[PDB]
Curated annotation (Swiss-Prot), chain A:
The gene is UTP5. This is U3 small nucleolar RNA-associated protein 5. Its main location: nucleus. The lineage of its organism: Eukaryota, Fungi, Dikarya, Ascomycota, Saccharomycotina. The chain holds residues 348 to 545 of 643 of the full protein. It comes from Saccharomyces cerevisiae (strain ATCC 204508 / S288c). Interacts with snoRNA U3. Interacts with MPP10. Component of the ribosomal small subunit (SSU) processome composed of at least 40 protein subunits and snoRNA U3. In the absence of snoRNA3, forms a complex with other t-UTPs. This complex can associate with pre-18S ribosomal RNAs. It is found in: Nucleus, Nucleolus. Keywords: Nucleus, Repeat, Ribonucleoprotein, Ribosome biogenesis, rRNA processing, Transcription, WD repeat. Present with 33100 molecules/cell in log phase SD medium. Belongs to the UTP5 family.
Swiss-Prot record, chain B:
This is U3 small nucleolar RNA-associated protein 8. Present with 16800 molecules/cell in log phase SD medium. It holds the Pfam family Utp8_C. GO terms for biological process: maturation of SSU-rRNA; maturation of SSU-rRNA from tricistronic rRNA transcript (SSU-rRNA, 5.8S rRNA, LSU-rRNA); positive regulation of transcription by RNA polymerase I; tRNA export from nucleus. The gene is UTP8. Involved in nucleolar processing of pre-18S ribosomal RNA. Also has a role in nuclear tRNA export. It acts between the steps of tRNA maturation/aminoacylation and its subsequent translocation out of the nucleus. Required for optimal pre-ribosomal RNA transcription by RNA polymerase I together with a subset of U3 proteins required for transcription (t-UTPs). Keywords: Nucleus, Phosphoprotein, Ribonucleoprotein, Ribosome biogenesis, rRNA processing, Transcription. One of its GO terms (cellular component) is small-subunit processome. It comes from Saccharomyces cerevisiae (strain ATCC 204508 / S288c). It is found in: Nucleus, Nucleolus.
From Swiss-Prot, chain C:
Interacts with snoRNA U3. Interacts with MPP10. Component of the ribosomal small subunit (SSU) processome composed of at least 40 protein subunits and snoRNA U3. In the absence of snoRNA3, forms a complex with other t-UTPs. This complex can associate with pre-18S ribosomal RNAs. PROSITE patterns: WD_REPEATS_2, WD_REPEATS_REGION. It comes from Saccharomyces cerevisiae (strain ATCC 204508 / S288c). Keywords: Nucleus, Repeat, Ribonucleoprotein, Ribosome biogenesis, rRNA processing, Transcription, WD repeat. The lineage of its organism: Eukaryota, Fungi, Dikarya, Ascomycota, Saccharomycotina. The keyword Lyase does not apply. Present with 6560 molecules/cell in log phase SD medium. This is NET1-associated nuclear protein 1.
Swiss-Prot record, chain D:
One of its GO terms (biological process) is rRNA processing. Interacts with snoRNA U3. Interacts with MPP10. Component of the ribosomal small subunit (SSU) processome composed of at least 40 protein subunits and snoRNA U3. In the absence of snoRNA3, forms a complex with other t-UTPs. This complex can associate with pre-18S ribosomal RNAs. Keywords: Nucleus, Repeat, Ribonucleoprotein, Ribosome biogenesis, rRNA processing, Transcription, WD repeat. InterPro entries: U3_snoRNA-assocProt_15_C (IPR018983), WD40/YVTN_repeat-like_dom_sf (IPR015943), WD40_repeat_CS (IPR019775), WD40_repeat_dom_sf (IPR036322), WD40_rpt (IPR001680). Involved in nucleolar processing of pre-18S ribosomal RNA. Required for optimal pre-ribosomal RNA transcription by RNA polymerase I together with a subset of U3 proteins required for transcription (t-UTPs). It is found in: Nucleus, Nucleolus. PANTHER family: U3 SMALL NUCLEOLAR RNA-ASSOCIATED PROTEIN 15 HOMOLOG, UTP15 U3 SMALL NUCLEOLAR RNA-ASSOCIATED PROTEIN 15 FAMILY MEMBER. It comes from Saccharomyces cerevisiae (strain ATCC 204508 / S288c). This is U3 small nucleolar RNA-associated protein 15. WD repeats lie at residues 36-77, 78-117, 123-161, 165-205, 209-246, 249-293. One of its GO terms (molecular function) is U3 snoRNA binding.
Length: 141, 548, 722, 493
RNA sequence: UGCGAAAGCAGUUGAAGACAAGUGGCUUGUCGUUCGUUAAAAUGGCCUCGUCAAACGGUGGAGAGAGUCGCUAGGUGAUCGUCAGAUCUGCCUAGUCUCUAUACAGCGUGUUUAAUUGACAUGGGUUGAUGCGUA
């Protein structure tokens, strides 16, 4: 090609990222589903993770996360964050799970030393969901 | 150039050992050791020893005795080893070697015939160097470095008995001519205030620096370029900096002339014969952040005033960018004389202080930028008005409008005049957030709440607000929530800050439901006026009329 | 390269600190002194000097120069034919010039050229001369409107004239003024036809014997350049689209050449058979300077044989009687048909009266191969200064920068601005920051995008590859005031530190595991005040960072990335409130650091933790630079000092359009002014190349530097076989 | 002059859980085959040499499948009890099978009728039989006799070495892949013993205490070996006798392992693990045995294998389940007068001094929207956006190119009811996504700015505007509640 | 236009002269005219140099598509009916369940961290659109 011809712009396979991925630093309760959820999260079992969080009764979700062990509430929250990042219609039903994980395990993940670095994907997903709120405010006006 | 300053034989062991340091003793028989226990046998003692070392075995120990030779000891087992005399004059500073690293038959008198670490192994006779008063051993390629008071430097390597280099080094009577921490240099201290680093591979000075103050017992630490130094008639062992993977914190070197300062670690209490107390407990020299602490060996501050670019035909200055003036006529002598003109009998009046300051600095009396000023000068005139004399109407108005006020601002709540207090809220450019939060939560329910929330938001980071607004009671925050719900943007985000910083669980319910209802209607009105701001052909048959 | 300032032979013609209207106006290939014998050129300047210069071998140390006996006239051009020589001259009502043609002779006394005065034209609007130089056309403005007159100059072969209302259509008199404004004209080597290019976009070939016109409509914006071929059967045209068209005048058939990195402001055929086209490309994405690229190209395959260009910086403001060229609408890249006179009056008044006379730019030096990288608008010119020719040119944003010649409305769109770029200290990566601007009159027209890109090349290839980009670093709509590359001790010189106007900092670093440049460290404060008076510095050890926000120089560490702390409180002063917002925090070496703010210039030691020196800047640099440009005005070294740099706009007996530069150096914490230099022109950027020199960029872009039998048979055979 | 820059497809910031190269490679193992066996598939080995066939050990038969048709080419049915192990020799020439009566029978592969020799091992069931990987003529059989045996296949009467020492149920052998004197055996008491065969052999030289009862031990390097048993697997440096990784990413016991090297893959090595709960997972030995991909199967997976390192054809992952069936997932791969007339067209300049090359490279074909943006047909480019078969990022990038490049209004000028309905009917779908909704916002804003009268006239885009209103209402409830979650974890810092 | 932060905050928009049109003046409008102020349109759009097919390597994906009326949560309709509720085995959406050449998109394989080969005489001539129906 010519020597005076400028180089065109080409991204190629450059990784486009945002500025918000901080990935670097007797019974009497119900019949819940938390053994299913716990041995979904001990492995990486997307299939039975989907069969445990297609349950959407609020008291079942509530005491399920209450009976959950708090050392893996952070990875339940990571799985929920990645699923609502990918599928956008899940944000309605699945963020009921993410608000209950914060309310119940409000001590474990305030005692964790790097909250944003450990659940970066939630922060990036909610930042990109709520960043454009003035724009669709102007749109619906 | 100092370090963290406090604390007013096998050379690589520590504690949990028995005695890896057996050393000689002043005004005693020969030598001793202690524990935190190994036996103290004899290395053919009772001579004129001045130091004592071992072969890094502690049961092949010795007494380095001034008799031209040395033998072995049995400090653990009971079985001695044989020896062989070389000289008979002074071997008081004998240092037995490792498995063929650095050894020669140099006693005291220029007879450095090379040998090995054995009782009968020999080498060449490398006694060629002159009468050396400072002979040390380093590990460049294990080498005897001689500094001679016939003055001349030489460096022989006891790896093939090869004289590596040598020159004419005019070294006088020294204090400590100790080899460097990486061994590449020679730190030789002059008597009172100086320590020069010379190149110990070519026998030449590389950096001849002065030191801070009096120091006598100086030696290089196990550091990059740092030394330790104890005072002569002082127990003060300070540190200075002119091993690099995971460095030392204690048990670095034992050469000191304090009150029996043997076996000097960081916690240097349990000595080898002395049984003394301990001191500082820091590590060696770091890269560059500890020299902001140890900012010593320079204390020569003067009164720095603003100079000017030198007038070499400055009359062709070509359209100066000021309003009307060209250069302020600087009067630092009148700046100093204004102190004498102010510290007078105007003990309640603004006739001989405020007029004096506004005559020395001809400004609009609330404005900067006609500067020529010093922070020590402003601090001393602020001290002279904080003395026998806030009733001046020009001086203490034009100098909270100065970015160098230096922390005499704490009584700004403790004096309460309205216009001077609001001016010290808005314009005083260094304010303590403790007093700012106290003034914020000592509410007088006025617009100065907005004026104090403004500054507490616009000069402190949010987490530094949160950690120091944890330091509040609960009646303050309950009345704060009550006053917000009663009766704006910066106080909304301040309300966000108080909710983030009160904590998680320990709350009440009625205040929470009141705040919930209030902010629900607040989001509703914010949504509707955001909507308001974002809100700012022919038929087939007609019938009409025309003029008649 | 015949350097003018190399010798007093013709630097005595111009070395002035005030007068650069002495310009070089024509070059001729022969020797006007002695005929019939050529390897040397005779240059006519715009004042009246005629220098004869040998460009084969070494330049002679006394050229054959003369000075023609001239009136107040100022030398439009000269003209050559067989044997004879003409010259044309300009004059002193309505602001129009006036032209006057002379003929030359030389022979009797070999110092003077005698002149003859053929004729005059008492008001000239526009002019052109044919390719052979045998005839010339021009416009008149003689009343209801203008007029058009063609005249052969080397003979009275033809001279005709007519009012151009007989050229113009009947539609144009009820249309806009662009339809009757004429911005170009050309004649062929016979004077049979003439091309009138109008500002509306059309061209019209009139046939001069009978004044019948033919319209050629392709240019959708104004026609800026026209030329004929030698036989007259092809018309080259160029305009605001960056497309050179050539019209086959038999069938009216265009051949195009579409993406020519600049608008064609002049085009002409060049060879005897017409095998080259020479073009001038105006490159009008930056409005602050008129930077022309000279590009001939062989006519065979239309490939750019020998493109020529100077350095292309973009200054912060317009420079010196710079007028962006004519067009159809008044845009942000051009100006309409009305506003040229008002725009030049306003620009002269802005340079006279106003206060923010800062036109300073950022230039970077690639620390591997020592060539300097002028970031143009949405592109970079990589340019090496040991031969002063461009290495290449590369588009670094995603605009409509290259794909399209924008026209009348579309010139109100701007491609994203590259505002920062810095190399990592081993020259392996290039960090760049750009502001992507939205088009107007839609919902998202008032929120910018901020994009930080990371580029890589090996040491052979001339162009960089994007490895990653982060859109909105630091958050949405927030700028980057300063990026700082990192020293060789953090991630082997593969980290960058970006600063907000909130005082937030982000440390980005490239790790090989996840093979990308990712976000490592973060310190965000959430204030409610913003200021772009942000500066940054790093310790060479890689331990502590000096974050010079406005009025406040915070001291952060690197391990926990918060403000510096020692629990012993050994007067741990970790903030330095100064009298004004600080714009340089340049640390010369690990002992001390020079702060520069808009009143004073302080220096602060850290092995002796207090102020050591101070200087007065307010009488020199008061409110004249934008806050954040003292960092490009002053610089440093790594051993041997620091360089301040001030500017004096000169004065009459009010300020003027003339400038002088006062650069000063200091060694070792502001001790001695051991360099006090004065340069004859405004200075825009200074920076230290990595081998103890400092390069600076003049406002007219001269880079300067502050440093430390058989013999006769052989001769006759090389004659007779060449 | 340059060439024209291509229209760059709008890529947003990347979302979490992107497609890694490892999981793209391991996800193109597809077209699963399910073959119902008579009983649980206990072992599966591959042919080493032409690595293109594999033997599946069901109950009382061993079937060799081909790696190109996936049908049973050959089968071995003349066992008396349940056949347990079946492996090929390192030359791939013959096949050993341990049987529940303690009768090792070795046939030759690809000939089920010629049983070559029947070693009568212990009276207990023989559960693992494999040849040496360096040597050819020795066969190691461990049984439920708590003693393994090395047999020379010439002298098949007494075992040439008898490796005893284990307290319970030795179920696995392994050989160390550079030292051929080194046999690592693994039993149901934990305790990977390993033996130097030049010594006595009744005592291991050392023992590695996997705490769970091991199910398999394989050798990865000449130095490190991996033992699975219980819910985890551990890796052991063998020159230093010392554990260095352990991954417990399963629910139930890891039944088997195998390992791949140097094959055509982004992963330079791969250890896959099969674990009685349905899962088979692949772990990458170069970044600290991190899991990269996995398959879930319809029952507890008892054994697994992949095609060997030199497969050169159709590549296989096979997993046999305890349910009694077998799952295969593969990745696949004019006249002499006229020629004498047109001879030279394949010469390419070998003996020729100068070789000129200016044939330009043929680039990718332009799509219709890209050539219409090139031809400045901006309304036609919008029309080419809203065809049905267009990718969502392609509609987004032509909207963004018309937004940045020229004029939304130019692209929308000559429209009416029938030619706006594609745009708004796509804007319904694009208003949900984050990456599109800014562009959807300003395009809808411009079209209602300049078609507010067609709003009045046509009722059949009024309803489209109402549906768009309820869409933005749902999305604004979502973008508000996301800010509420953002605050409610900002509280927890 | 100035100060600014990317928000915003203060300032506006005169005079002379000439010309054109309309009805020597009067009105209106222009200016390749000057002084002062910090101050939309002339049917008129971007070149050839070789395409097609099949791979391969990284990069993104809202995945490209097809089912099961299988589950979870919903939004809603026709007719009758007092409601209760009936039939339409009511419809639509999202998630889940199942499957495919990851079907989708993009950059590259001339040297690159990586990754490419093959077809074709890259012409001329005659019909080819009024010859066509599966709608």
């Amino acid at each position: 090609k010519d020597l005076a011809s400028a180089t065109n712009y080409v991204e190629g396979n450059a990784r486009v990222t945002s500025g918000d991925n901080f990935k670097h630093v007797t019974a009497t309760t119900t019949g819940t589903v938390t053994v299913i959820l716990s041995q979904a999260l001990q492995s990486n079992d997307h299939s039975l993770l989907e069969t445990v969080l297609n349950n959407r009764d609020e008291r079942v979700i509530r005491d399920t996360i209450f009976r959950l062990k708090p050392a893996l509430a952070v990875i339940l929250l990571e799985r929920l964050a990645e699923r609502i990042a990918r599928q956008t219609h899940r944000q309605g039903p699945l963020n009921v799970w993410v608000k209950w994980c914060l309310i119940i395990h409000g001590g474990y993940l305030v005692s964790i030393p790097n909250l944003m670095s450990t659940l970066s994907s939630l922060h990036s997903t909610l930042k990109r969901r709520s960043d454009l709120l003035p724009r669709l405010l102007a749109l619906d006006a | 150039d100092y370090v963290q300053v406090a604390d007013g034989l096998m050379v690589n062991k520590g504690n949990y050992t028995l005695n890896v340091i057996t050393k000689a003793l002043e005004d005693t028989t020969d030598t001793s050791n202690d524990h935190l226990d190994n036996k103290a046998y004899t290395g053919s003692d009772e001579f004129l020893s001045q130091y004592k070392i071992k072969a890094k075995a502690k049961v092949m120990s010795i007494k380095i005795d001034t008799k031209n030779s040395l033998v072995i000891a049995i400090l653990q087992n009971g079985l001695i080893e044989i020896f062989d005399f070389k000289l008979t004059l002074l071997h008081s500073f004998d240092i037995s070697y490792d498995n063929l690293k650095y050894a020669k038959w140099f006693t005291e008198n220029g007879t450095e015939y090379v040998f090995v670490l054995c009782p009968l192994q020999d080498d060449k006779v490398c006694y060629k160097l002159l009468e050396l008063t400072d002979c040390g051993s380093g590990e460049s390629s294990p080498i005897k470095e001689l500094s001679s008071t016939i003055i001349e430097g030489f460096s022989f390597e006891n790896s093939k008995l090869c004289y590596q280099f040598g020159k004419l080094y005019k070294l006088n009577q020294g204090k400590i001519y100790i080899y460097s921490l990486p061994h590449c240099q020679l730190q030789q201290v002059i008597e009172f205030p100086m320590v020069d680093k010379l190149s110990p591979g070519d026998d030449l000075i590389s950096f001849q620096p002065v030191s801070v103050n009096r120091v006598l017992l100086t030696v290089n630490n196990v550091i990059y370029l740092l030394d330790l130094l104890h005072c002569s008639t002082l127990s003060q062992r300070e540190l200075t900096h002119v091993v690099i993977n995971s460095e030392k914190s204690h048990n670095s070197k034992t050469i000191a002339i304090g009150i029996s300062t043997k076996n000097g670690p960081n916690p240097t209490s349990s000595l080898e014969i002395i049984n003394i107390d301990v001191g500082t407990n820091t590590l060696k020299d770091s890269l560059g952040k500890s020299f902001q602490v140890g900012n010593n060996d320079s204390s020569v501050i003067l009164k720095p005033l603003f100079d000017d670019k030198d007038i070499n035909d400055k009359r062709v200055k070509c359209n100066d960018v000021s309003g009307d003036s060209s250069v302020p006529v600087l009067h630092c002598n009148e700046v100093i004389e204004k102190l004498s003109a102010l510290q007078d009998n105007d003990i309640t009046s603004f006739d001989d202080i405020f007029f004096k300051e506004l005559k020395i600095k001809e400004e609009h009396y609330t404005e900067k930028d006609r500067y020529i000023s010093d922070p020590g000068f402003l601090n001393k005139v602020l001290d002279l008005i904080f003395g026998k004399f806030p009733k001046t109407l020009t001086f203490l108005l034009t100098h909270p409008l100065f970015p160098l006020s230096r922390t005499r601002n704490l009584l700004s709540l403790l004096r309460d005049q309205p216009r001077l207090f609001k001016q010290a809220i808005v314009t005083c450019p260094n304010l303590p957030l403790n007093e700012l939060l106290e003034e914020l939560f000592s509410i007088r329910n006025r617009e100065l709440l907005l004026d104090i929330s403004f500054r507490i938001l616009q000069d402190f980071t949010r987490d530094s607000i949160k950690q120091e607004m944890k330091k509040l009671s609960k009646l303050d925050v309950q009345n704060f929530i009550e006053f917000i719900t009663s009766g704006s943007t910066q106080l909304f985000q301040l309300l966000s800050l108080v909710l983030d910083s009160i904590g998680l669980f320990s709350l009440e319910g009625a205040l929470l439901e009141n705040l919930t209802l209030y902010i629900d209607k607040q989001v509703e009105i914010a949504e509707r006026n955001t909507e308001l701001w974002n809100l700012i052909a022919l038929p087939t048959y007609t019938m009409e009329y025309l003029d008649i | 390269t015949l350097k003018f300032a190399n010798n007093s032979l013709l630097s005595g013609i111009f070395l002035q600190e005030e007068e650069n209207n002495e310009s070089i106006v024509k070059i001729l290939l022969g020797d006007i002194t002695v005929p019939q014998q050529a390897h040397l050129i005779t240059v006519f300047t715009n004042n009246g000097h005629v220098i004869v210069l040998n460009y084969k071998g070494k330049l002679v140390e006394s050229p054959k120069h003369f000075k023609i006996s001239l009136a107040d006239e100022k030398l439009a051009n000269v003209f050559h034919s067989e044997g004879n020589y003409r010259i044309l001259t300009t004059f002193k009502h309505n602001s129009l010039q006036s032209y006057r043609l002379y003929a030359l002779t030389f022979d009797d006394a070999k110092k003077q050229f005698e002149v003859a005065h053929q004729a005059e034209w008492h008001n000239v609007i526009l002019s052109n001369i044919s390719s052979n130089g045998k005839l010339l056309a021009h416009m008149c403005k003689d009343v209801e409107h203008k007029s058009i007159s063609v005249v052969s100059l080397f003979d009275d072969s033809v001279n005709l004239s007519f009012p151009l209302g007989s050229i113009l259509s009947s539609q144009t008199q009820s249309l806009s003024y662009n339809t009757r404004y004429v911005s170009s004209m050309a004649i062929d080597n016979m004077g049979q036809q003439l091309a009138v290019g109008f500002a509306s976009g059309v061209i019209s070939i009139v046939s001069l014997a009978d004044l019948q016109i033919r319209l050629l409509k392709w240019h959708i914006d104004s026609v800026l350049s026209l030329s004929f071929s030698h036989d007259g059967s092809y018309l080259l045209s160029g305009g605001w689209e960056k497309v050179m068209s050539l019209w086959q005048l038999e069938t009216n058939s265009q051949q195009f050449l579409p993406r020519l990195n600049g608008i064609i402001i002049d085009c002409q055929v060049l060879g005897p058979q017409g095998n080259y086209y020479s073009l001038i490309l105006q490159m009008t994405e930056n409005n602050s300077n008129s930077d022309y690229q000279f590009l001939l190209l062989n006519a065979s395959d239309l490939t750019s044989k020998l493109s020529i260009n100077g350095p292309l910086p973009v200054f912060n403001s317009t420079i010196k009687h710079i007028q962006q060229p004519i067009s159809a609408m008044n845009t942000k890249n051009s100006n309409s048909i009305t506003s040229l006179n008002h725009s030049k009056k306003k620009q002269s008044r802005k340079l006279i009266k106003s206060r923010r006379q800062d036109f300073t730019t950022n230039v970077e030096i690639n620390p591997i191969n020592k060539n300097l990288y002028f970031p143009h608008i949405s592109a970079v010119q990589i340019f090496d200064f040991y031969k002063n020719e461009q290495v290449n040119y590369q588009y670094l944003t995603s605009g409509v920068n290259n794909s399209m010649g924008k026209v009348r409305f579309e010139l109100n769109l701007q491609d994203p601005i590259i505002t920062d770029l810095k190399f990592t200290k081993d020259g392996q990566w290039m960090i760049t920051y750009e502001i992507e601007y939205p088009p107007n009159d839609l919902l998202s027209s008032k929120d910018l995008t901020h994009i930080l890109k990371f580029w890589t090349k090996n040491d052979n290839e001339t162009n960089w590859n994007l490895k990653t980009k982060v859109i909105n670093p630091h958050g949405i709509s927030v700028p980057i005031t300063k990026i700082l590359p990192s020293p060789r001790s953090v991630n082997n010189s593969q980290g960058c530190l970006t600063a907000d106007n909130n005082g937030g900092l982000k440390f980005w670093s490239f790790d090989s595991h996840e093979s990308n440049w990712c976000l490592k460290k973060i310190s965000l404060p959430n204030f409610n005040h913003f200021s772009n008076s942000v500066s940054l510095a790093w310790s060479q050890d890689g331990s502590l960072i000096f974050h010079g926000f406005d009025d406040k120089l915070q001291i952060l560490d690197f391990d926990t990335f918060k403000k510096f702390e020692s629990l012993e409180n050994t007067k741990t002063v970790s903030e330095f409130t100064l009298d004004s917002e600080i714009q340089t925090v340049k640390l010369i070496n690990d002992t001390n650091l020079i702060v520069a703010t808009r009143t004073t210039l302080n220096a602060i030691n850290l092995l002796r933790g207090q102020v050591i020196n101070s200087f007065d800047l307010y009488p020199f640099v008061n409110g004249v630079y934008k806050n954040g440009h003292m960092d490009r005005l002053i610089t440093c070294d790594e051993r041997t000092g620091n360089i301040a740099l001030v500017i004096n706009q000169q004065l009459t007996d009010v300020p003027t359009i003339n400038y002088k530069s006062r650069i000063i150096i200091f060694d070792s914490d502001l001790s001695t002014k051991l360099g006090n230099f004065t340069h004859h022109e405004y200075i825009s950027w200074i920076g230290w190349n990595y081998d103890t020199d400092f390069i600076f960029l003049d406002i007219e872009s001269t880079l300067g530097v502050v440093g430390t039998n058989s013999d006769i048979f052989a001769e006759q055979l090389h004659k007779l076989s060449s | 002059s340059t060439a024209r820059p291509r229209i760059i497809t709008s890529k947003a910031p990347l979302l979490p859980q992107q497609t890694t190269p490892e999981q793209r490679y391991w996800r193109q193992y597809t077209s699963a085959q399910l073959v119902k066996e008579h009983n649980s598939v206990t072992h599966i080995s591959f042919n080493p040499q032409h690595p293109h066939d594999f033997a599946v050990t069901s109950s009382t038969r061993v079937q060799i499948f081909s790696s190109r048709t996936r049908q049973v080419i050959k089968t071995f049915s003349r066992f008396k009890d349940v056949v347990y192990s079946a492996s090929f020799r390192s030359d791939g020439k013959l096949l050993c099978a341990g049987d529940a009566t303690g009768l090792v029978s070795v046939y030759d592969s690809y000939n089920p009728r010629t049983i070559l020799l029947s070693i009568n091992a212990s009276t207990h069931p023989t559960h693992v039989t494999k040849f040496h990987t360096q040597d050819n003529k020795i066969l190691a059989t461990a049984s439920d006799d708590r003693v393994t045996r090395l047999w020379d296949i010439s002298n098949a009467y007494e075992p040439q070495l008898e490796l005893t020492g284990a307290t319970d149920y030795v179920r696995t052998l392994s050989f160390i892949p550079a030292a051929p004197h080194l046999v690592a055996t693994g039993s149901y008491d934990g305790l990977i013993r390993l033996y130097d065969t030049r010594s006595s052999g009744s005592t291991p030289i050392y023992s590695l205490n996997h705490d769970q009862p091991v199910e398999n031990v394989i050798a990865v390097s000449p130095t490190q070996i991996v033992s699975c048993g219980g819910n985890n697997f551990k890796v052991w440096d063998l020159t230093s006798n010392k554990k260095l990784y352990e991954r417990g990413n399963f629910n139930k016991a890891v039944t088997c392992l195998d390992y791949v090297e140097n094959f055509d893959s982004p992963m330079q090595s791969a250890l896959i693990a099969s674990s009685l709960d349905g899962h088979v997972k692949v772990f990458d030995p170069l970044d600290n045995f991190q899991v990269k991909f996995g398959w879930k199967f319809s029952g507890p997976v008892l054994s697994c294998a992949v095609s060997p390192s030199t497969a050169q054809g159709n590549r296989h992952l096979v997993a046999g389940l305890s349910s009694g069936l077998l799952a295969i997932r593969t990745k696949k791969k004019k006249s002499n007068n006229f020629q004498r007339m047109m001879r030279g067209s394949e010469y390419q300049g070998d003996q020729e001094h100068i070789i000129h090359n200016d044939k330009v490279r043929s680039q990718r074909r332009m799509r219709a929207f890209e050539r219409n943006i090139n031809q400045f047909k901006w309304s036609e480019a919008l029309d080419n956006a809203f065809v049905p078969g267009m990718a969502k990022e392609l509609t987004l990038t032509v909207l963004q190119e018309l937004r940045k490049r020229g004029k939304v209004r130019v692209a929308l000028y000559g429209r009416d009811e029938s030619t706006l309905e594609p745009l708004l009917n796509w804007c319904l779908k694009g208003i949900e996504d984050v990456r599109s909704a800014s562009i959807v916002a300003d395009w809808v804003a411009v079209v209602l700015e300049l078609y507010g009268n067609t709003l009045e006239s046509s009722p059949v885009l009024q309803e489209l505007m109402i549906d768009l209103k309820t869409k933005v209402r749902h999305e604004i409830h979502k973008s508000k509640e996301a800010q509420r979650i953002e605050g409610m974890l900002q509280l927890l810092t």
